């Protein structure tokens, strides 16, 4: 023929060949696992078995998925007695205003007073409480604190637990499919003689005693393998006729040139003359190309969709606190009645009167 | 026979054949991949940097799997003034004495109330400042927990994907190895020998096959003859043209055919030859033996899951209600306002009438 | 030849064939699979809707995943008591005087005293009312932070199953994918040809097959014939010049068998026929090239992980204990009991005496 390259392929068919043994282990057993989730998430410091309980029963479905695999005196006496009636009256008027300032300004001070006691033993009170609530929030605020390590810690565990029964899972498909491999060499090669070569052993089969083994059955296959190989030119095809109208195509063996066209098998460069034995009349160079490909798709790159802090940005708040100190004034600054020592200048005037008494 | 159906099987037998080429490319390769968690987790904020610390050794473990891939009268006159003096002296030492001990007295126990007024208040100023101090970290304690949530709940959204995508590289990497044992098969199977099973290097049989190594994989030119025409024929799954199962003939190398009797047939050519020993081994007396046999897979993502969010949550949720408290006051202080004081000033007018009198 | 076990290798070779017939179903079919992930994580209380956003596009990257599958001294004498009594008027206006000056200075004292006490327990009022505000407010928040977590440890929890849900169904979509080349496989080398390889369609060698297309994947029923009675006999690996050896004959297409001396069979037949230069490729000298090779897989998930939680929960945990405070603060303020005021009563008394000797 004329592919799309030139007739000239070159082959190196096998001159000789020499006894092979190949000793395989095919493995057709992986213990299934059980995963305690308590255990192997934790086990540990105890908050992790309560916050695990909160966590849910992510243990039982990943081994749902596990499992699957005169009288002028007188008047001076009156002028006395004058004097003495309005001291008298006055003395008294004085005096009463006294005792009822003096008795409202008692009651006025005692009320004063028991406002003090009342608002202080309030106020002790209402501090306490306020002890009390800001105590219990602070406590709160700790084991939400505290909880949340631990809460990153086991989520970091659960992490690596969902990549390791990613990897036992993928472990036990990849032995499935081994079995297979094994059940098929079981039935093409120890229960029979094998075409394909490269399935139990290089080259042919001559027998292949198989034995069981510790998790997978072992095969000793035995068979030739080839081991010096001559060279020639060959067709992809003789064509025999100018150029294509009708053609030979080499059966069970490549067309060589000797050192004009001979066959052969594959086996043996055994040249024998090409003859309707060896051949089977193929179309007219009908070529036809058929491209095919086999391909696998990588997606762990690197860096991943977007940076973390476009992504936080659309919904993290930066969130201040309003932190606020509650305004106060100290405007009590003092009561600091004073100069009541004017009251010793009025014991002074008491002396006088004593002297005058 | 007489098998689960008819004798009767209709066979397209290879008329004429037509040359092919096919041009293959196996994957044999998949670089292995490093995860660097602090740069794929983020190297964003670095708050996630920091959180990711705790986080733990994730990212060393997710690696070991995926590197695994009169005068006396007058007197008493004077004498009843000096009786009433006498009297009066007395009484006026007397009021004033009592003046001095209760204005004292008041003194004291005012500036008493004063120094009470004012320990008070400055006390009070301390504890409320602390107030503000104890209440001012918690805000702040607390926005720093309610911060770090948000981005706490991103970095667990991140390493979800990462578990899935390390799951991908797992999965590529064992298929891509399975294909390298195609490889190996094609390699020993077809560049090194001619093939006798077709479809495993060109359609139809194969007469050569030249690989050659491609950027990540081989890539494969084999070229082997195809059928182009098929003849049709009814065939029988193989008779011994007996009337009674005692021993039948069965094709070997080719189908049995019948001609427009029976004729054998090999899988190449429509080349009719009568049935001799050569082209038949002595089956059994139609012992048909069948042999169900399946290939089966599981399926179980169904989209909803064992139970709904609400149940699962209620079992362990504590709706959880704050018992918020206003603390209980009362302004019990409404006033101490002394008051007609002025009274003093109508005493000051009692003491003026007499002021001057004299 | 002489390998590692000696010439002798016992093999059963087939007498008596009968007819079999396998019915296969090959998958080739998984519906791909979309996830909800609001729905499947969450679809119950809004705040696993909620909380679940802020998680970001752990959806997006997982469907990526998954879609990739004497007259006057008597006046004198009053007088005298007079010039005493001028010295007492005097006087009784000047402790009045200081009386007057005392009440009047303790009145804008005692009012000044009501002011404090009236301004300081308003303040002390709205400060309180604040302190509830400000206190009241953080429980609230501080709720919402206690609630948001357990939800966030649920959903987080939901988040994990779906990664192994994700990664079973990954597995079972490329499984199936392997399972199309078997049958691709099988269609080209056994529906459209007879296969030399037995196990390809049957026990035994194949005499026809035909598929049929099934619910999701082929239906191939195959006929073949298969070995029932297998006779047994001593047989030699391979036969040399019967001596040390320098050049041997090889069984090429049937082991070579010794009678009840050696004759050459074929792997179908126990048909002996004398060993001769049709069945034997010559072998070398007994050049045994031993080849060990293996296949092999790895396992890694042990029940225990690297270490245990407290160590590594330790190299950051913080234990993280409350400084808890009691604001400190001091009940001072004693009664102040301004008393004994009774003396005023007294002091009343003695007016009465003189009001009454008036
Ligand atoms: C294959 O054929 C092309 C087209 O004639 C020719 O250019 C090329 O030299 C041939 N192959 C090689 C690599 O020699
Ligand atoms: C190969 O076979 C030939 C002919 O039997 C023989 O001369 C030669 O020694 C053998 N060995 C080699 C070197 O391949
Ligand atoms: C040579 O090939 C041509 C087509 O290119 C064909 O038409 C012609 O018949 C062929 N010649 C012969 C007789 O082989
Ligand atoms: C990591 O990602 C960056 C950007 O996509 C790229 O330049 C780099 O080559 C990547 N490395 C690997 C091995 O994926
Ligand atoms: C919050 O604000 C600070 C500056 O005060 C800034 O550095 C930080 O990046 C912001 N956080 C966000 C929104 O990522
Ligand atoms: C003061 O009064 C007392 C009691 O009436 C009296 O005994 C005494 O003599 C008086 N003293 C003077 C200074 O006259
Ligand atoms: C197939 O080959 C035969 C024998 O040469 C010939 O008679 C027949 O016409 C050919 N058919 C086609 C499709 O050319
Ligand atoms: C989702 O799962 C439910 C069972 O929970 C099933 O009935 C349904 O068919 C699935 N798909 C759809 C269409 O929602
Ligand atoms: C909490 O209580 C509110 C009001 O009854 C209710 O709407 C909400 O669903 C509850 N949350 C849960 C599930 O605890
Ligand atoms: C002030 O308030 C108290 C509260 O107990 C009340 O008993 C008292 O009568 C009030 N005083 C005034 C001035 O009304
Ligand atoms: C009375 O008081 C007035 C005003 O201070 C003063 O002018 C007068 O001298 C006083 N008289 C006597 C003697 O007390
Ligand atoms: C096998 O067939 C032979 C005749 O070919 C017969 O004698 C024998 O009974 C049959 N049974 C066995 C041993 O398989
Ligand atoms: C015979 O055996 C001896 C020792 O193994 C060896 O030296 C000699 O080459 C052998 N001859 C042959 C080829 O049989
Ligand atoms: C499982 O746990 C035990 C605990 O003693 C440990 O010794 C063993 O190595 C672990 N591996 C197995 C058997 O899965
Ligand atoms: C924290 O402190 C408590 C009380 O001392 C202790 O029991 C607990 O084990 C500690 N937790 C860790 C691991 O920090
Ligand atoms: C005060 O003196 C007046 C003089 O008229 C008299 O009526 C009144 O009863 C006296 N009061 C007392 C209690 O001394």
Known sequence: VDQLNSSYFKLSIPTNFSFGVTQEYIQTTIQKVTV???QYVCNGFQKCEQLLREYGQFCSKINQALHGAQQVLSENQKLIANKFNQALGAMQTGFTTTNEAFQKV???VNNNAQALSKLASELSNTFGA???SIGDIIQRLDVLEQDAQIDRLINGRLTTLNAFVAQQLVRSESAA?????????????????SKRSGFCGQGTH????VVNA????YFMHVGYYPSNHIEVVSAYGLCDAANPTNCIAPVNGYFIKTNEWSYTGSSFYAPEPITSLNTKYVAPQVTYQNISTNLPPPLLGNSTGIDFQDELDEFFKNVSTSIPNFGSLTQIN????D???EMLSLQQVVKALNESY
């Not at 510790?214 to 059955?217: A, E, I, R, T």
């Not at 003092?334 to 009645?337: A, D, G, I, M, S």
């Open 214 to 217: 510790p998790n997978g059955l």
């Open 339 to 341: 100069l009541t020592y």
């Open 130 to 132: 306020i002890s009390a």
């Open 206 to 209: 001559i027998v292949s005693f």
């Open 177 to 193: 499919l081994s079995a297979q491999l094994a059940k098929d060499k079981v039935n093409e090669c120890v229960k029979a003689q």
């Open 106 to 108: 008692q009651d006025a």
């Open 334 to 337: 003092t009561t600091l009645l």
């Open 36 to 38: 305690d989730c308590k």
